[PDB]
């Protein structure tokens, strides 16, 4: 029952030393990070999960660069930031699954040659 400011697609280049996949929540009422649980996926399983109750970032070997900024997780921003290394490798449909306590919404966004 969470709402987002949608973003259908985002573009990257090789000039982009890092890439951002935006995901914003407009109605998250959590006042602390213990209450938030984020889960990003791309064509299947969880590239990135952050368990706010334990503050444990988990990343596959092939997404060791992926990260979010927790200092604005309460402000509604849980956008993944990686680099072209694992961006050029992996381009497709990424999904932002955010959970605050009992409620939960989700959104998906799309991830230019010369």
């Amino acid at each position: 029952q969470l709402l987002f400011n949608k973003t259908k697609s985002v573009e990257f280049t090789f000039g982009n030393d890092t890439v951002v996949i935006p995901c914003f929540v407009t109605n998250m009422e959590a006042q602390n990070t213990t209450e938030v649980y984020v889960k990003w996926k791309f064509k299947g399983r969880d590239i990135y999960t952050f368990d706010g109750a334990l503050n444990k970032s988990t990343v596959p070997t092939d997404f060791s660069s992926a990260k979010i900024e927790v200092s604005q997780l309460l402000k509604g921003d849980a956008s993944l930031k990686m680099d072209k290394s694992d961006a050029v490798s992996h381009t497709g449909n990424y999904t932002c699954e955010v959970t605050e306590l009992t409620r939960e919404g989700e959104t998906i966004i799309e991830l230019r040659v010369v």
Partner: antibody
Amino acid sequence: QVQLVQSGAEVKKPGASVKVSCKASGYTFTDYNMHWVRQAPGQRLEWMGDIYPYNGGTGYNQKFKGRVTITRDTSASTAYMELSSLRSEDTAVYYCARGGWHAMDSWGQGTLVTVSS
Amino acid sequence: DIVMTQSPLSLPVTPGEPASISCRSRQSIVHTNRYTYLAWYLQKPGQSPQLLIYKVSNRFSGVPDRFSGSGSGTDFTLKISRVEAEDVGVYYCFQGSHVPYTFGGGTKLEIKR
């Protein structure tokens, strides 16, 4: 303060209908999902349905197929629940329950309707 | 409807001792999403229900560290480190995977003074 206030207790004869209010305060009405739970003796508590106040979508328990209607009013931040053609099986305390897609995190007083002649 | 069974139906415990409540389901409550939403509730004497554990083992805002949930698919169990006089009441397991959502019978907690 997150607080949910419903209407008072009621009395109906079998074959009639009852509509129980649930006014919500302390939060933004359409930010959460709202459920309806009842405790009838001597059975378990029974999830009867839900309503999402933003879109108005609903999902019901087909145990009550054809006789429950969960309605919505955001102008007053009040959700409603109608149960038609009553019998001695439905006399119970009806709980209006706020929460997410699959859990309720705050509940109301409870509405005890007695169906009797 | 997915039946859910709890045991015991009543549990005498002196405060300071553990107390475990189990609630099993005929068929698994794992959803397509690969999450299993089992929520533990308690109806305090004279007061409407309140939530303690959501999603098998995640506690609610304001619940002490002493209420912990576990279990997988079929079997689940609600455990507490120690019970206190404030914990009196009856506890419900609740499934959040398949419509219709169902509740458990109810394990009633009694304090031994």
